[PDB]
Design a protein around this ligand. Structure first.
Ligand SMILES: C[C@@]1(Cc2cc(-c3ccccc3)no2)NC(=O)CC1=O
Ligand SMILES: C[C@@]1(Cc2cc(-c3ccccc3)no2)NC(=O)CC1=O
Ligand SMILES: [Zn+2]
Ligand SMILES: [Zn+2]
Ligand SMILES: [Zn+2]
Ligand SMILES: [Zn+2]
Lengths: 197, 197
């Protein structure tokens, strides 16, 4: 009857958030983003994106680490796989790129849980947790993984981003604030047995 | 990188839906429902409810089996555990009670996946996929399980219910139609690798 995965959470105060050089997006606008998505689809097919969910707590209240581009959109650490790249090795690479330390000490990322899939049917913003009706060639597949943090870690945040610890109640039913993926993280995390260490 | 659970789905046409005597709710109204919930909380503490998600497909389109009380509210097969009752044995008991055959042939329910948790903080309708802030004594804990169906099965539907096969797109973002639990099932099922048999 214990069919739940057990996940160790540690206090937000256990983690050190340093700073490093800005990390710039490949697209300077939504228009460019969808242009490049069109160009790559015609060369190498469906975009494969991976996103990591990193959880901490304070006073046994779970928080998801989000990356805020200045004071704009919130995103999960993650991004685009290269063609032929393993999903898990790819997320470890992208999370090292985004939050990895300047002193070049290896963070040990542990990824043992897929927590969802999202599909983009067109070169447009709408994404669904399923392939919609009549769609044979989705333009993007996004896969979310739960990342088990070590007890303590040093993270280097690119100077152009803020790292925010978002409590679940704030995500819940707040698609306008966070979009349909991050806003459904409370539902997607409810199945886990969190230890508050 | 295959961290997904693999789930066999079969066609809706593989399953036989017979009929049996009505199965009446213990509460004749929302008011009675919350009254009885108050009375039991003071005797035996937090209500423990279990709900099963049974999935089929037609033409590789996944459908969740819902029970419609006449033409009213949609519910998952499930209900209240007795004090000291195992969650999994309890859901098998409740699903036998609701959909079990009249000829008293055993359905073999396979339950290997928790897909979420919901908490009712007050004797009121609101439920959250987490224990809300300042709540030490939640009044109900609801646990959802994915039920792996056999290739073929005979189900006996109580005459006062309809068994509806609901496609995911219809559930998605339709809390008004289905409430916050069923409406978030597409997100909660997205992590599974469905085989369409
Ligand atoms: C190639 C790369 C690498 C990348 C990831 C991030 C990033 C993701 C999440 C939070 C903060 C930063 N910025 O650049 N460039 C892009 O424009 C998308 C992408 O995958
Ligand atoms: C004790 C019991 C048994 C039960 C379950 C169902 C039922 C659930 C889902 C779909 C269709 C029918 N109706 O009665 N009586 C109640 O009033 C709640 C409960 O747990
Ligand atoms: Zn504390
Ligand atoms: Zn795909
Ligand atoms: Zn077919
Ligand atoms: Zn509980």
């Amino acid at each position: 009857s214990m069919l739940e995965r057990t996940i160790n959470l540690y206090p937000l105060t256990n983690y050190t958030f340093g700073t490093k050089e800005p990390l710039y997006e490949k697209d300077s606008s939504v228009a460019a983003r969808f242009q490049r998505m069109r160009e790559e689809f015609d060369k190498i097919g469906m975009r494969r994106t991976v996103e990591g969910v990193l959880i901490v707590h304070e006073h046994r209240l779970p928080h998801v680490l989000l990356l805020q581009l200045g004071t704009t959109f919130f995103k999960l650490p993650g991004g685009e796989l290269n063609p032929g790249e393993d999903e898990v090795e790819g997320l470890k690479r992208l999370m090292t790129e985004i939050l990895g330390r300047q002193d070049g000490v290896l963070q040990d990322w542990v990824i043992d849980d897929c927590i969802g899939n999202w599909w983009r049917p067109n070169f447009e913003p709408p994404q669904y947790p399923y392939i919609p009706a009549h769609i044979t060639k989705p333009k993007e597949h996004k896969k979310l993984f739960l990342v088990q943090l070590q007890e303590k870690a040093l993270f280097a945040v690119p100077k152009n981003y803020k790292l925010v610890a978002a409590p679940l109640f704030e995500l819940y039913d707040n698609a306008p604030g966070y979009g349909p993926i991050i806003s459904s993280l409370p539902q997607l995390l409810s199945r886990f047995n969190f230890i508050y260490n």
